[PDB]
């Protein structure tokens, strides 16, 4: 596809996600005015397209948290992650998707793919900017630490899909702190 053809496809698929409608590839092809074969050629299967849709929504979440987060260094990184995780936890569109297709979502979110790659590359960028600002001391590359932060956190954010009671945000933050070489002094 052209960048434009793919954009129309993702934008339409994203509206279905936001409207809490399942990603019906036939409904999508009809809305685009294209055949099912043309649609597959443009975006791949339903899972590949949903991953792209969710990865773009993930980027928007991260960017908003980065502009709204306070402080510098590990305290800023902790704030961005806390904000992103709580925003994801309160998502009604995600909630509707996870209730209907938990196994598809576990795969898209917690297996290497679209969601983990954008989360890791935006985290890597956050780490590099903090190192560039003289606010963070790291021994491993931002790419290595960014991927590690995402991998350690995501199973906690999505803990109810894995058989647990609730999103384990505080535990994920404790792991980020430990990875950054800082302490979290909990009370109450
Ligand atoms: Ca184009």
Author numbering: 2 to 189
Give sentences copied directly from the paper behind this entry:
In R. erythropolis, the lactonase QsdA has been identified as the only lactonase. We named the incriminated gene qsdR (quorum-sensing degradation regulation) which codes for a transcriptional regulator of the TetR/FabR family. QsdR protein possesses a DNA-binding domain at the N-terminus and a regulatory domain at the C-terminus. The DNA-binding domain permits the protein to bind DNA inducing genes activation or repression under its control.
